[PDB]
Structure formats: C-alpha cells, structure tokens
C-alpha cells in the first residue's frame, strides 16, 4: 500500500504573551496510513489529557488531525510536538516558537 | 443526512 | 457563493486487537457538524456544531441507523478486498468513503460525489454524470461490474440529487449564523533579522473563515515566487483558519516588500507594508 508522510505545524490559537492562558496545536496533515502518535511536550516532557479532532481526511486520500490543550507560555518554559508514524525512523520533535 | 444506499465491493 | 456537504468515513483494520476502528464525519464547507466514533461509548451519531444539537430523536436515531449499518457494510467490505487481493488476516488496511453534494448560491444542484480508497490508492467512482463508474484496477472493475447489475449508481444518484441536496439547503438555513458568516483576516507583519543584511518579514492572516486564502509577496510590484516560505492553512480550534508567508529580504530594503490578501471577506484585495 501508499505511504505518506506527515507535515507537521506546531503553534498557539491566539498570538502568545507570556502569563496568559492559550490553546497550544499541533496539525499534522497529509499522512497516510492513520496510525499516528502525537504527544505535545512542556520542557522535553509529555503533557497529558491532550484532546485531538476527528480523524478526516482531504481529497487526495491523506489524513488530517489537530492536537490541542490548554496551556500558558511563560519565558522559562519550552514548548513542543512529538511526532510518530510509520514513514519516520524515529519519533520527530518540531520546537514551538510564538513567531511561527 | 447520511447516505441510506449501502454496497457491498 | 457555492457550498458543499461531505462526509467522510475511514474503516481500519486492527489484526488481534478486535473489530475494525470505523470513524465517519460530517462537513458543510469548512464546518463539522456531526461525527460517529466506533471506539467512544454511545454508539450513536454525535452532534459537533451548536445549530445541529435542537434535531430531535428521529433524526438522532436515523442518522444512527444508517452511519451503524454503512461501519458493519464497510467491516465486510475489508474482508471482500482481502479476498480480491489474496492479503492476509495478519495486516492493517483501510478502507475510506467520500459522498456529498455541492449546491450553487441559489440553492440549486451543482455535483455529487461518491468515491472509495483502498489502502490510500482510488477503487471505485461514480462519475461526474452518477451514471457509471470509473473503476482503479481489475479488482474494481469486478465491484463495477456488481454494481451495474445491481443498478447501484441510480440509487446513489436518487440521493445525490435529492435527499442530499434537502439537507444542505436545511443545513444552510438552521446553521446560518455559522456557516453563511465571513471571518475576514486579521493581519500583522514581524520582522527579524537573520544575518548582517538579511531580515525575515513574515506576513500573518489570522481568525479568518472560510479556510480558503491567498498570501503573496511582491518585489516593487512584482509576484516574488522565491526566497518564500509559505505554511499550508491551519485550524485555530475556535472555527477560524490561520496561514503565514515569509520572505528573507536584504536590511534596508524591507519598504520594497509587499503583502497582499486575498479573501471572501475582503472585498477589495489588501497590500501590507512593513512598518
């Protein structure tokens, strides 16, 4: 069968400012198969109770999920998603920066 | 309103 | 002003961990608006759009009825490809379904849609006309095949023309508040500096509904298709989309560079300029 590996976009619901209560995404898109593992990071560290969309998909077939939780930027504290599927040798770590 | 047609392939 | 509904319905095989995972989800435009899980505890059809949740029982129970019975037809449907491809009971596979309609500004019919993947690659699909079939390979042209002498394609098109349609136009009107709304963009440009004479500008849209935009940079009036990143367009999680386009531009010379916007909200294209 196909195989399609995913695009990745880590980022904020509303632009971040440190103190304030956010919604920290990751969008992983353009996959195939489904079978995916996506766990947000706080300082190199899986957050838990992390909600996620219901698995659709666009015209070419690939799949689409959006993996959201509550969270507060702060200057101290890194942010980021962990990624697996099937197409990667190892789980791949994209960092969040508030400018992109 | 989902489809009623079902098929089997 | 033309719009869309679809539903979408994924069937994955999970070799010694039980019966095939079945999720379905219904869309108007960019909008969800129900969704039906094998794996959560209901069973039933589920509501994901505030205008939707008034429908009584009967409409709760039919829709059930009929995502349930598509899931149990789809978990046999994956044994059929099994046979036709002689895969063994060992892998996963996946079996996806595409239908829905699209209607113009007037409410009026436009195209129907019913179309099926096997494992990422097209099987079969009714055609433009819902009339016949285009079928990806041998295995498919043996469901084509079934389903002529079944007559499968007037059934679906019965749908497709009517029922589908109905529910689209009801759609429009109770969801209207959500799903006839234009969020245009909200826009902002940072810059930062990568290099001794080099800067980064990126152009920002965000909260904007529909999903569908238009960011470009232009160079003194013209279309700068290099030295660009562009992100694809993203969900916020609140019915809104966000996208960015950056340029890495020479310091000094950032007044050269512009931005421009398109969107349904936006009734006259808009150009951005740093500071």
Known sequence: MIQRTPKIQVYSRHPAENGKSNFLNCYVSGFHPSDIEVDLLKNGERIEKVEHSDLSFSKDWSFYLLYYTEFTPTEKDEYACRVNHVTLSQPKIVKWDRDM | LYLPVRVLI | ?275
């Open chain 3, 1 to 275: 002003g033309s719009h869309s509904m679809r539903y979408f319905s994924t069937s994955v095989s999970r070799p010694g961990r039980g019966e095939p995972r079945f999720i379905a989800v219904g869309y108007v435009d960019d909008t969800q608006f129900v969704r039906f899980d094998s794996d959560a505890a209901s069973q039933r059809m589920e509501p994901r759009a505030p205008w939707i949740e008034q429908e009584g029982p009967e409409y709760w129970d039919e829709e059930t009825g009929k995502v349930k019975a598509h899931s149990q037809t789809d978990r046999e449907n994956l044994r059929i490809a099994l046979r036709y491809y002689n895969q063994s009971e060992a892998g996963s596979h996946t079996l996806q379904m595409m239908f829905g309609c699209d209607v113009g500004s007037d409410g009026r019919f436009l195209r129907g849609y019913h179309q099926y993947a096997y494992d990422g690659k097209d099987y079969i699909a009714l055609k433009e006309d819902l009339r016949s079939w285009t079928a990806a390979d041998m295995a498919a042209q043996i469901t084509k095949r079934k389903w002529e002498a079944a007559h499968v394609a007037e059934q679906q098109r019965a749908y497709l023309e009517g029922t589908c349609v109905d529910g689209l136009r009801r759609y429009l009107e109770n969801g209207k508040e959500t799903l006839q709304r234009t969020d245009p963009p909200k826009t902002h440009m940072t810059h930062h500096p990568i290099s001794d004479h080099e800067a980064t500008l990126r152009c920002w849209a965000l909260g904007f509904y529909p999903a569908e935009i238009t960011l470009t940079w232009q160079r003194d009036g013209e279309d700068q298709t290099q030295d660009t990143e562009l992100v694809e367009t993203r969900p916020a999680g609140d019915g809104t989309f966000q996208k960015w386009a950056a340029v890495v531009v020479p310091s000094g010379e950032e007044q050269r560079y512009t931005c421009h916007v398109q969107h349904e909200g936006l009734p006259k294209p808009l150009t951005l300029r740093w500071e």
